[PDB]
Design a protein around this nucleic acid. Structure first.
Ligand code: SF4
Ligand code: MG
Ligand code: MG
Ligand code: MG
Ligand code: MG
Ligand code: MG
Ligand code: MG
Ligand code: MG
Ligand code: MG
Ligand code: MG
Ligand code: MG
Ligand code: MG
Ligand code: MG
Ligand code: MG
Ligand code: MG
Ligand code: MG
Ligand code: MG
Ligand code: MG
Ligand code: MG
Ligand code: MG
Ligand code: MG
Ligand code: MG
Ligand code: MG
Ligand code: MG
Ligand code: MG
Ligand code: MG
Ligand code: MG
Ligand code: MG
Ligand code: MG
Ligand code: MG
Ligand code: MG
Ligand code: MG
Ligand code: MG
Ligand code: MG
Ligand code: MG
Ligand code: MG
Ligand code: MG
Ligand code: MG
Ligand code: MG
Ligand code: MG
Ligand code: MG
Ligand code: MG
Ligand code: MG
Ligand code: MG
Ligand code: MG
Ligand code: MG
Ligand code: MG
Ligand code: MG
Ligand code: MG
Ligand code: MG
Ligand code: MG
Ligand code: MG
Ligand code: MG
Ligand code: MG
Ligand code: MG
Ligand code: MG
Ligand code: MG
Ligand code: MG
Ligand code: MG
Ligand code: MG
Ligand code: MG
Ligand code: MG
Ligand code: MG
Ligand code: MG
Ligand code: MG
Ligand code: MG
Ligand code: MG
Ligand code: MG
Ligand code: MG
Lengths: 137, 208, 148, 231
RNA sequence: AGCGCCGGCCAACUCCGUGCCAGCAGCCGCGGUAAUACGGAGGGCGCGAGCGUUACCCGGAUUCACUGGGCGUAAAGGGCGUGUAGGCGGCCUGGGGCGUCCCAUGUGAAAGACCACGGCUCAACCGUGGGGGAGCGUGGGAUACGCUCAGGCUAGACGG
RNA sequence: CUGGUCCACCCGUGACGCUGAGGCGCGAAAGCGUGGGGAGCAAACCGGAUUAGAUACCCGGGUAGUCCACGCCCUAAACGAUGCGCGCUAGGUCUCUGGGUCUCCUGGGGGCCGAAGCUAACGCGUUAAGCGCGCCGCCUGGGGAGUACGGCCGCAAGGC
């Protein structure tokens, strides 16, 4: 595996499209600091550090909208979109002045900074820029 | 120069009275009362659905033919309004109404914009006390547009200001009759006019 | 009541022994100018029936499209197969910046100010469907924190 | 109104011909057969019977839908008990989404209900006459319970949602509550008010249907006891 | 007071003449005896001391796609391996601080551009003021991620 | 004599990995060089038919070649017209081959039908053409043309 972070953004994306209750992610500190963001921001009910076949994983507890009426009752997603930005093949660094607003503020951007992992709104609060990890809405 | 040709065929093509003659436009002799169809051979033929480019071109000729202004200036003034602060439609209208020759017409010194233009180009109008013979001069909030001293004793503006005693000029304006001077108080808002034009379509025209 | 606009009329054709025999397709959006739009495609053997048939279906396929001072709440891109519409909110004094097909949809929804751009197949029909699905996916802050 | 010893009729079947979306109502796969858990059914009946009783309480109308062999006659009885519309034999496409058009076949029905209600004129060709007596029966063969359905229903109660996906699909398209009893071979997401359980045992089909109708009587005033639980 | 245009794109139509001729044509296309497409005329549309044309640049062209494209059948997977350089790389702890982020400071000429105000009657033109950056030099700081060095692990990989 | 590969135990090494411009090797048939072999078959070729013709299809013959050894050539509808690696996202059915506690459970392959999703549609769908990351190859209207010039390769044909 070549990008553990994009793997986790994708494990969740695939899990929410089949409306799974939870999905396990290979465990790592940087991934906690990203799931830390996703829970506090409402995108996931949260996570816990578990143990699958002896190895540390991260059970992510997903979340969905209300059951809808019409054909296709499947509920609208709470994470509509979770997209890698900086990749091993092309790193993306923005200073504080060029941090993007995701969907006119109705979405978040997770970044890595020398003050820790923040949301876009957290970054301008601390006045720092960093590496654009992903955008989510 | 400006269009110096027949003028009733203008309203006939646009399909609405454009008060471009003064007196005649309020009599039964106005050609928009008698024949309200486009001029020329096929006017009385029943119209087809025009294209949306036609709808916008027509709104933009209506606005331009109101002020009797060349397309070059009408587009020049549009582009200043565009790049200006925010609301383009209001600014284009306000900058249009800021023209001296127009202000002479709104003040009532002249009965038509064509005549108003001539009152200026012949020097009969001054701005804050100086002869200003430029039709496109931009009047701004504060100025006093008057009739020249060597002009105030001339039949035309005497009679014109007479019927102006009976008229109530626009709010953004001021008029002291018998002194034959007026004041431009502020550039008009949107609703200060009910110009037979949807200026939003004019923006749509140039955005193609 | 609601207001109608005929975006598209077109003549199609099938074949038989004898020659071509025609049909007519009517693509009509109907709006309230205050947040209700609908899109309908009506096909019939003559132009008036289709134009009238499409306006029927239109009234039974409406979208909420929640305005915000005449503009949409957030930027949106939708693909309907090779057809792609981009919509970006825009300030007051800007206008509706769209080709004829999405304009008829946005203007009938009461959108007074927006930036659009078509991409890929600018096939009017599929562009019209993709514009409707774009409006259908418009969210507000009250929509999203309720979800979270 | 319910039971706990209903586990003596069905608790599921259909061997490994399942729908994976049903697993959250399955307790174990024992004798080759998927076994349905009824503690999942008991909670669900509490939902469905909450919906059914509350629906009749305000003047509702449930279109009962049964078509297969094991549920053919029982759905006729139970819907006639509560005076409810049933569809017995074939589900005519559009019956819901094209209601104002199929209902145009019950007016033709009522016509031959007047004609062969002696006499208008029977003295018009017997061939032309007995022509109609066959058109009369056919209309009765398919519109016998749908005729009392005078307006688009408030909900539908189907025996098999897989076997009856057409009816479900129409009702889902009309924002009509789809309530149904279904075993291991169907899609829970398509049912608004689910009754997980066998839909092939007549011993079970009648059970969850007959004493569901009983609940409909007590919600529109007064009770009755005996219905056909034929053996 | 002139110039272009009036088949669709694309705003503006009738009569005559011509008869696959004479001709038009940016593309699709017009003309073979009732041509809104050729030529003239009436009328009409667009501009106006201009209006057309040709040439060329950018745009429309997300048609070189960083923003922002693709490759089963539309153009597009190398006939297949092996492997050099190179690109890229799992979990945990720390040392550094190269990338990266921040703060301070120097440089970023004038003119131009943009905003405000004013001088030529206006304007074009022009004066006066204002406001910025990126990039680089330097000083201070941060250490999540990328880098490196060091130590540990076993999920990748390899061997018994 | 020799390769690959799978499975069981979870015993050893401790990220030793993935991809891969160049390079190098392999590369159906046909063809080429030198020997050898030659039943059958059969380009070319000869004859008999058919036909307006019949430099064909049909028939009777028949030389390369088809076969072997070594050395070349390096092409293809060399196809799954689908690059390699890895992770993730319902199941049902048939089969090959392992392991177990032998209903079945579990690996590694080979097919069919299909969830979600993708697709212009056809269709794809845990053997992805779905959702993702890495790296490589390649496309950018048709014809001219895989031609010319140049370069490298080849005995030549001709290949890149
Ligand atoms: S007289 Fe009538 S038609 Fe003529 S210019 Fe005045 S308003 Fe127009
Ligand atoms: Mg920077
Ligand atoms: Mg005159
Ligand atoms: Mg523009
Ligand atoms: Mg432009
Ligand atoms: Mg809303
Ligand atoms: Mg696409
Ligand atoms: Mg399309
Ligand atoms: Mg295209
Ligand atoms: Mg096109
Ligand atoms: Mg069944
Ligand atoms: Mg022109
Ligand atoms: Mg034009
Ligand atoms: Mg036109
Ligand atoms: Mg040209
Ligand atoms: Mg003739
Ligand atoms: Mg002809
Ligand atoms: Mg003629
Ligand atoms: Mg022509
Ligand atoms: Mg032409
Ligand atoms: Mg002509
Ligand atoms: Mg000029
Ligand atoms: Mg160009
Ligand atoms: Mg454009
Ligand atoms: Mg470009
Ligand atoms: Mg090109
Ligand atoms: Mg790109
Ligand atoms: Mg392309
Ligand atoms: Mg091809
Ligand atoms: Mg291949
Ligand atoms: Mg090759
Ligand atoms: Mg290497
Ligand atoms: Mg590296
Ligand atoms: Mg790393
Ligand atoms: Mg540094
Ligand atoms: Mg500077
Ligand atoms: Mg400077
Ligand atoms: Mg200056
Ligand atoms: Mg300056
Ligand atoms: Mg071990
Ligand atoms: Mg060890
Ligand atoms: Mg070979
Ligand atoms: Mg050979
Ligand atoms: Mg040989
Ligand atoms: Mg021989
Ligand atoms: Mg012969
Ligand atoms: Mg022969
Ligand atoms: Mg012969
Ligand atoms: Mg012969
Ligand atoms: Mg032979
Ligand atoms: Mg032979
Ligand atoms: Mg021989
Ligand atoms: Mg093959
Ligand atoms: Mg190929
Ligand atoms: Mg490759
Ligand atoms: Mg194989
Ligand atoms: Mg298999
Ligand atoms: Mg599907
Ligand atoms: Mg894709
Ligand atoms: Mg299909
Ligand atoms: Mg198929
Ligand atoms: Mg398939
Ligand atoms: Mg499978
Ligand atoms: Mg090429
Ligand atoms: Mg080429
Ligand atoms: Mg070749
Ligand atoms: Mg060659
Ligand atoms: Mg050569
Ligand atoms: Mg090649």
């Amino acid at each position: 595996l070549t990008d553990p972070i994009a793997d986790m953004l994708t494990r969740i994306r695939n899990a929410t499209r089949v409306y799974k209750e939870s999905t396990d992610v290979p465990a790592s500190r940087f991934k906690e600091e990203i799931l830390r963001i996703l829970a506090r921001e409402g995108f996931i009910k949260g996570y816990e550090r578990v143990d699958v076949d002896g190895k540390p994983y991260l059970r992510v507890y997903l979340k969905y909208g209300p059951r809808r009426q019409g054909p296709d009752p499947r509920p609208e997603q709470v994470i509509h979109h979770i997209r890698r930005i900086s990749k091993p093949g092309r790193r993306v660094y923005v200073g504080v002045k060029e941090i993007p607003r995701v969907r006119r503020g109705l979405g978040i951007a997770i970044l890595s900074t020398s003050k820790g992992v923040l949301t876009d709104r957290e970054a301008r609060k601390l006045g720092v820029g960093g590496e654009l990890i992903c955008e989510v809405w | 120069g400006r269009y110096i040709g027949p003028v009733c065929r203008l309203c006939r093509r646009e399909g609405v009275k454009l008060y471009l003659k003064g007196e005649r436009c309020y009599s039964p002799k106005c050609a928009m009362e008698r024949r309200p169809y486009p001029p020329g051979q096929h006017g009385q033929k029943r119209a087809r659905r025009p294209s949306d480019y036609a709808v916008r071109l027509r709104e933009k000729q209506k606005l331009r033919r109101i002020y009797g202004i060349s397309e070059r200036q009408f587009r020049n003034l549009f582009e200043e309004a565009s790049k200006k602060k925010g609301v383009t439609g209001s600014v284009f209208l306000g900058l249009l109404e800021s023209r001296l020759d127009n202000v002479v017409y709104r003040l009532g010194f002249a009965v038509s914009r064509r005549q108003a233009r001539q009152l200026v180009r012949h020097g009969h109008i001054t701005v804050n006390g100086r002869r200003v013979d430029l039709p496109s001069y931009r009047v701004r909030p504060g100025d006093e547009i008057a009739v020249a001293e060597k002009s105030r004793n001339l039949e035309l503006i005497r009679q014109n200001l007479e019927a102006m005693k009976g008229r109530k000029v626009g709010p953004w304006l001021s008029l002291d009759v018998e002194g034959m001077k007026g004041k431009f108080l502020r550039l008009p808002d949107r609703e200060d006019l009910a110009l037979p034009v949807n200026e939003q379509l004019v923006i749509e025209f140039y955005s193609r | 009541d609601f207001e109608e606009k005929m975006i598209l009329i077109r003549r199609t054709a099938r074949m038989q022994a004898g020659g071509r025999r025609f049909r007519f397709g009517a693509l009509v959006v109907v709006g309230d100018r205050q947040g209700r739009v609908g899109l309908g495609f009506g096909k019939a053997p003559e132009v008036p029936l289709a134009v009238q048939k499409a306006g029927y279906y239109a009234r039974r396929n409406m979208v909420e499209v929640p305005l915000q001072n005449g503009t949409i709440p957030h930027e949106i891109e939708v693909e309907f197969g090779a057809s792609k519409i981009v919509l970006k909110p825009a300030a007051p004094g800007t206008g509706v910046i769209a080709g004829a097909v999405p304009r008829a949809i946005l203007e009938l929804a009461g959108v007074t100010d927006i930036l659009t751009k078509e991409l890929g197949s600018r096939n009017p029909i599929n562009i019209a469907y993709a514009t409707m699905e774009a409006l259908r996916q418009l969210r507000t802050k009250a929509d999203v924190e309720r979800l979270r | 109104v319910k039971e706990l010893l209903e586990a003596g009729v069905h608790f599921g079947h259909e061997r490994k011909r399942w729908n994976p979306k049903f697993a959250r109502y399955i307790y174990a796969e024992r004798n080759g057969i998927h076994i349905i858990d009824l503690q999942k059914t008991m909670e669900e009946l509490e939902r469905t019977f909450r919906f059914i009783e509350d629906l009749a309480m305000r003047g509702g109308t449930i279109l009962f839908v049964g078509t297969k062999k094991q549920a053919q006659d029982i759905v006729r009885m139970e819907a006639e008990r509560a005076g409810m519309p049933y569809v017995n034999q074939r589900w005519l496409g559009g019956m819901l989404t094209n209601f104002k058009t199929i209902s145009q076949r019950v007016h033709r029905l009522e016509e031959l209900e007047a004609l062969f209600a002696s006499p208008e004129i029977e003295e018009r060709p017997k061939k032309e006459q007995v022509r109609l007596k066959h058109e009369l029966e056919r209309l009765q063969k398919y519109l016998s319970g749908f005729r009392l359905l005078k307006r688009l229903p408030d909900a539908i109660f189907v025996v098999d949602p897989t076997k009856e996906a057409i009816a479900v699909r129409e009702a889902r398209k009309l924002f009509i509550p789809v309530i149904a009893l279904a075993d291991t071979d169907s899609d829970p997401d398509l049912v608004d008010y689910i009754i997980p359980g066998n839909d092939d045992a007549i011993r079970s089909i009648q059970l969850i249907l007959s004493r569901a109708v009983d609940l409909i009587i007590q919600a529109r005033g007064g009770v009755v006891e005996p219905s056909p639980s034929y053996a």
